[PDB]
Each structure stands twice: as structure tokens, then as C-alpha cells.
Structure 1
């Protein structure tokens, strides 16, 4: 890779790994549309298996970007509408607080305080209906943003209802396959286990535990090769051949709500570029949102990003459409979000 990209990447990631005690890490920088990879340490400390470009890391909430886009694809197909009420696709949702809660609300965490996690005790399809039917909104729809897996996960599940496919088959055939993400999975196949890194939490190797709506909110595992093309796919969607998917990517980067200097998209979050670190550098943060009416089309001078975690993994994706610049950081250690965002910034700002 060009020496500048190489020195910045190393001058930056090295102390990051040393400071955060990161077992293994993969990084991709997309410069003027071409991927450049870097990898350090172990996927499995015990078996001395190193991190390589084909290692699968858990993405955590970064999975939400895939769901936003799958959702955006279903819209472009005319199968769902963001202005539709949630009950249109889950008629059994008769509790009266749902009147007024739309798919847009679910997708953007503005439904009224849906919880950050679907409680662990929710295991069956009846357990889930119960949980949603009994949930008590803290606020009116469209008034505050509370980042939640249970909000965006339901959106993902309902978004694919008209299609007729499982959320997984809709994701595989409508996002993964067209984009040639051949090593990205919701459930890792036995054939691919040899590449599944272990995550680390307190020195113990862990893998994400199953739970309700996990596929739709934090379930996807992937390699930095596939993540790099994912960044590439979102940077220049005009390049994409399948139509509804191209409109889909475009819709996930639309600006629906504004909170501070941040704009909420479908999965992806955006800020105006150029931007300052602290504008982008706490287990719950309820914040008021002003609706963007109508939603602003995807803005090229944005710092489009997404953070994500699991008990054992820390992920981060960030890209600037108008500069053809992007970065992906995959660690098998859930370290602090500010530290990730500073490394990204430190690297991308040094590239223009």
C-alpha cells in the first residue's frame, strides 16, 4: 500500500492495540476506491491462529447498517413504506400505544423509548409479542431518540414481511449476494468456523450468545475484505447494478432526524463533513430530535459512521462519500468507542 497510508495506519493503530490490550485486529482503508488491508495479532490466542484478511469478526450493532439497507431495499421495491404504521405488518400488536408508531420510528429509535435490549427471558415468538404489547412508552412518537436493538430489530423483522422470505434469506439474496459479500454471515457455517475468531472479555474467549431479534440488530459476522466492499458499496452506490438496492443504500443515508450535530439515517449515522473529533469523540442517552421534513437526500460531505459491539468484539466503520475515503476497524476485544473514533479520524483526516 502507498507509504503514507501505511505509516498513518501503523503510527495510529500500533499504540491503539498496545493501550487497549487488543488481541487481534483487522483494518481496511478505502482510498480513492481501492482497499488497503492491515492485520495484527490473534484471532485465537489459545490455538495461536493469527488475524488474517479472511478472519470473521463479530460486528455487533454495525449489523444495523445491513438492516437499514435491507429495509431501504424493501422500500425501493414498494413492499413497505416508512410512513406505514407498525400495526400494518404485525396486526396482533393491538396495545393502544402503537397507534401512531410507524416503521420510520422503529428504524430510527424514535418510537418512544423502546428498550436498548430485548430482555433475555424473551425466547419465543409469543414471548416477543408479549414484550412489545406490554412495553410502556416513556415519550410520544417522534420526540426523542433512544438507541435500541429492540427498535431497529423489529423494523428489520417487519421490513421483510411482505417479501415472504426469512430475514436471513432476504439479507443473503438481496444484500450479501449482489454485493459479493461471500464471507459475511448471520449464522456462521461449520465450513467457516475455522475463520471465526474468538472475542475477548476479561481474558476469556467468548462468542455472541443467541437472543431475540439478534440477526436484525447485532448478529452479522464478517471479514475486513467483505467489510471493505461494504464501505465501498455505501460510498458510491451509483456503481451498484441492482436497482432497488442502489436506492436502498441511498435511503439508509438520508437524514431523517437531527440531534445535536448528528443526523439519524437507516442504521448509518451522519454528521456534516468537515467535522471535529469531539463532535464525534454512557449506557443510555435520551436526546430530543427535531424532524427533518422532508428527509434530506444523502449528503456527500458527511462523515457516515457506525459503532458496534458484542461481549467480545469492538467494531467501527466510517466513510466520507465525497472523498472516496473510508475505514473499517475490527477487533476481537470490545474496547471504548471514543478510542475507535479517534483512530478513524486520525487516519482519514490525514488522508485529506
Structure 2
């Protein structure tokens, strides 16, 4: 690999692993459209299994970027419209607070304060309907952004309804397969367990537990190679042969709302480049605080901007992931770890690396 990439990655990540006590980590840097991989430590401490380029990590909320692109692909296929009322897909949502809430609001966390998490007690389809029917919005739709699994999660579930496929089948056939993400999974098959890293929380080995809308909001597991290919695909959508998928990727990076320096896409979040780490942290869900922020609609949405820092953070109880890329520089990075460490530290490292290589 080019020495400049080798050096900045090792000089940045080694200290990070030491400071955060991360058991295992994989990093990919995409430079001028080529991936370079790095691994450290352990996927399974007790069984002494090292992290490799084939190790599966829980992506946590980075899964939302796949959900956003799958929704974009459905829009491109003419199956759904973001301007469609949620009730068009779920007529059973008869409670009056749902009047005026569209798929756009669900996809962008602007429905009026849907909760951060779906309660553990909510499991079945009937439980889910009851939960959304009982939810009382704090605000009118399209006025404030409140990051939430229950918002983009519902968007993903509804977006695939016209297809006639389960969410998992739609993701596999319309996104994973076309992009050759052959070691990316919503449910890890038994044959792949030998490569599934354990997450570590308070020193205990853990894997994510089943939950309602998990697949849609935080349930994808993937390798550093497939994630590098996902970044490549999002950096250069015009190279994608499947027209609706190319279009869907472009729709997911469009700018729908602005709050401060941040713009909300479908799954992806974007800031204009150049920008410093402090601004990225404060202009993203990478902050320690859970924040309600008024938003300004971008009418109509701005098509994907090349000079942007496009990114997404993700976590599960035992994992911490981060993806960021800058289209106009053909540069990107994926950082996958089996410990859920502070988001600001992820942004700091990613920025240090990409700024050095830009």
C-alpha cells in the first residue's frame, strides 16, 4: 500500500485503540477509487481469533444508510413517493396525529418526535401498530429533527411493502447482490459464524439482540471489504449498472433539511467540505447529547453535492462503526470496532486520516 496511507492510518488508529481499549478493529481507506485495508487485535478474545478482512462486525446505525438507499431504489422504481402519506401504506394508522406525516418525515426524523427507540415490549406487527397509534407527537411534522430508530425504521418497513418482498429479501436482491456485498447480512448464517466477531461491553462478549424494526434501523453485519465496496458505490453511483439503484443512491445523498451546518439525506448525513471536526461533531448525531433541533426545509431538495463530508455513525451494545467519504476527492474511510467507544473520537480519527490524504 502507499506509504502515506499506511503511515497516517497506523499513526492515528494505534493511539485510538490504546486510548479507547478497543479489542479489535478493521479500517478501510478508499483512495482514488482503490481500497486499502488494515486490521488489529481480536474478533474473539477468549478464542484468540484475530480481526481479518473477512471478520463480520455489527454496523449498528450505519445500517440506516442501507435502509435509505433501499428506499431511494423503491422511489426510483416508482413503487413509493416520499411525498406519500404514511397512511397510504398503513391505512390502519387511523389516529389523527398521523394526518400530514409523510414517508419523507419518517425517513428524515422530522415526523414530530417519534422516539429514539422502539420499546422492548413491542414485538409483533399488532404491538407495532398499537405503539405508533398511541404515540403523541410533541411537534407538528416537518418542524424539528429528533434522531430516531422508530422513524427511519418505519420508513424502511413501509418502503418495501409494494415490492411484495420482506425487508431482508428486498435488501438482498436490490442492494447487496447488485453491489456484490456477498458477506453482508441482516441475519448471520450459521456458516458465517466463524467470522462473526463478538462485541464487548463492560468486558463481556455480546451480540445484538432481536428487536422490532431491528433490520431496518440497526441490524446489518458486514466485513471491512464489503463496507469499502459500499463506500465506493456511494462515492461513484454513476458506475452502478442497475439504474434504479444508481438513482436510489443519488436520492439518499440529496439534501432534504438543514439544521446548523448539517444536512439530512436518507440515512446519510452531510456537511459542506471543507469543515473541521468540532463542527462535524456538533453538526451530527456524533454528539454525546440527544438533541431536538429545528429544521429548515430545502425546497426542493438539493441533489447530491460533490464537495461534502458524507457520513454516518453506528453502534450496538458491543460495537462502534463509522463511515465517511468526500465525493469530490474520491476519498473515504470505514472504521469498524468491537467496542462502542465515543463518537467524537471516531470523527477525530477519520478527519485526521482523510485530511492528510486529501
Structure 2 residue 17 is the aligned partner of structure 1 residue 17: yes
> 1:138 offset after TM fit, Å?
0.4
What secondary structure does 2:318 align onto?
coil
Rounded Cα–Cα distance in structure 2 between residues aligned with 1:318 and 1:73: 21
Rounded Cα–Cα distance in structure 2 between residues aligned with 1:149 and 1:224: 24
Rounded Cα–Cα distance in structure 2 between residues aligned with 1:168 and 1:4: 40
Rounded Cα–Cα distance in structure 1 between residues aligned with 2:236 and 2:176: 17
Write the deviation string for residues 197-227 of structure 1: whole angstroms up to 9, x where unpaired. Answer: 0000000000000000000000000000000
Rounded Cα–Cα distance in structure 2 between residues aligned with 1:98 and 1:283: 28
What secondary structure does 2:181 align onto?
coil
Rounded Cα–Cα distance in structure 1 between residues aligned with 2:124 and 2:241: 38
Rounded Cα–Cα distance in structure 1 between residues aligned with 2:276 and 2:259: 16
Rounded Cα–Cα distance in structure 2 between residues aligned with 1:320 and 1:30: 10
Rounded Cα–Cα distance in structure 1 between residues aligned with 2:124 and 2:22: 36
Rounded Cα–Cα distance in structure 2 between residues aligned with 1:301 and 1:124: 43
Structure 2 residue 321 is the aligned partner of structure 1 residue 321: no
Write the deviation string for residues 95-130 of structure 1: whole angstroms up to 9, x where unpaired. Answer: 000000000000000000000000000011111000
Write the deviation string for residues 283-316 of structure 1: whole angstroms up to 9, x where unpaired. Answer: 5200000000000000000000000000000000
What secondary structure does 2:357 align onto?
coil
Q: Which runs of 5+ in 1 are unaligned?
A: none
Number of residue pairs the alignment of both structures matches:
352
Rounded Cα–Cα distance in structure 1 between residues aligned with 2:289 and 2:328: 33
Structure 2 residue 70 is the aligned partner of structure 1 residue 70: yes
Rounded Cα–Cα distance in structure 1 between residues aligned with 2:322 and 2:307: 19
Rounded Cα–Cα distance in structure 2 between residues aligned with 1:32 and 1:291: 34
Rounded Cα–Cα distance in structure 1 between residues aligned with 2:126 and 2:85: 21
Write the deviation string for residues 27-52 of structure 1: whole angstroms up to 9, x where unpaired. Answer: 00000000000000000000000000
What secondary structure does 1:162 align onto?
coil
Aligned residue in 1 for 2:303 = 297
Q: Which runs of 5+ in 2 are unaligned?
A: 282-287
Rounded Cα–Cα distance in structure 2 between residues aligned with 1:74 and 1:37: 32
> 1:74 offset after TM fit, Å?
0.1
5 Å-filtered alignment, 1:66-105, equals: 66-105=66-105
Structure 2 residue 200 is the aligned partner of structure 1 residue 200: yes
Aligned residue in 2 for 1:165 = 165
Runs of 4+ aligned structure 1 residues displaced above 3 Å come to none
Worse-superposed segment, 274-283 or 318-327:
274-283
Rounded Cα–Cα distance in structure 1 between residues aligned with 2:155 and 2:316: 20
Worse-superposed segment, 273-282 or 244-253:
273-282
Rounded Cα–Cα distance in structure 1 between residues aligned with 2:150 and 2:221: 19
Rounded Cα–Cα distance in structure 2 between residues aligned with 1:283 and 1:96: 31
Rounded Cα–Cα distance in structure 1 between residues aligned with 2:232 and 2:123: 36
Rounded Cα–Cα distance in structure 1 between residues aligned with 2:251 and 2:239: 15
> 1:19 offset after TM fit, Å?
0.1
Report the TM-score, using the length of structure 2 for normalisation.
0.98
What secondary structure does 2:208 align onto?
coil
What secondary structure does 2:65 align onto?
helix
Worse-superposed segment, 272-281 or 138-147:
272-281
Rounded Cα–Cα distance in structure 2 between residues aligned with 1:123 and 1:320: 38
Write the deviation string for residues 158-189 of structure 1: whole angstroms up to 9, x where unpaired. Answer: 00000000000000000000000000000000
Rounded Cα–Cα distance in structure 2 between residues aligned with 1:50 and 1:342: 25
What secondary structure does 1:185 align onto?
coil
Rounded Cα–Cα distance in structure 1 between residues aligned with 2:166 and 2:293: 33
5 Å-filtered alignment, 1:1-352, equals: 1-281=1-281, 282-352=288-358
Worse-superposed segment, 282-291 or 73-82:
282-291
Worse-superposed segment, 282-291 or 214-223:
282-291
Worse-superposed segment, 255-264 or 276-285:
276-285
- Alignment RMSD (CA, Å): 0.5
